[PDB]
């Protein structure tokens with residue numbers, strides 16, 4: 001099973017990707033996580049992203065295409081994968097198509113813009129794994145601690161209100177056109193498309209996704 005999650009920053013993609021990876025046994029491919037990890041480790045492929053993410057802007061297509069190509073070639077993707085945060089531009093989607101990377105489901109998270117800032121300013125992450133929490137809306141069992149390892153959560157350097165508003169502008173200009181892109185692909189029979197109400201509680205969105213995926 002191959003899945004793309006579409007939606008604005010803060011729509012809930014990383015949150016729901018974790019459940020899907022747990023239940024269906026396919027890896028989550030998050031370009032944001034991969035880029036942040038490359039910066040942290042000083043990896044030659046991706047360390048360049050530091051100042052760009054800080055500015056709320058998109059990394060170059062060629063950098064994230066290279067990262068994703070490297071990642072999905074790995075054996076743990078042989079049976080499928082989930083993309084969360086990629087593709088982010090029409091050229092990134094076309095690069096997938098040209099490489100023959102078809103997907104089974106495209107799942108769009110519908111969330112009002114007005115909810116995004118308060119979601120992202122409360123976001124806390126377990127950097128080693130990517131797991132995501134919210135201090136008020138989806139808290140860990142123990143404050144400031146990852147549920148799975150118990151390790152300290154952190155706040156992403158780019159999760160400030162003003163940076164979020166810049167990311168939302170980028171989303172509307174560059175990334176929202178992928179909704180139509182994959183709607184058209186679904187009409188051709190190349191994927192299944194579904195839209196979900198991302199304002200429901202985390203557990204209910206999860207249940208809604210399980211209905212679709214099986």
Ligand SMILES: Nc1ncnc2c1ncn2[C@@H]1O[C@H](COP(=O)(O)OP(=O)(O)O)[C@@H](O)[C@H]1O
Nearest residue numbers: 009010011012013014015119123133134137202
């Ligand atoms: N259904 C929801 N209701 C309220 N908050 C949510 C919901 N889903 C996720 N969140 C929280 O909002 C923030 C954004 O979710 P996240 O999954 O990181 O979004 P994305 O990966 O789409 O940017 C996180 O702090 C997360 O805990």
Ligand SMILES: Nc1ncnc2c1ncn2[C@@H]1O[C@H](COP(=O)(O)OP(=O)(O)O)[C@@H](O)[C@H]1O
Nearest residue numbers: 009010031032053056057058059064085086088
């Ligand atoms: N596919 C991508 N193309 C370009 N830039 C990306 C991509 N994925 C992540 N980024 C960069 O990483 C930043 C954080 O993205 P991400 O972790 O997906 O956060 P959010 O879920 O809040 O959108 C983006 O603002 C951008 O700089």
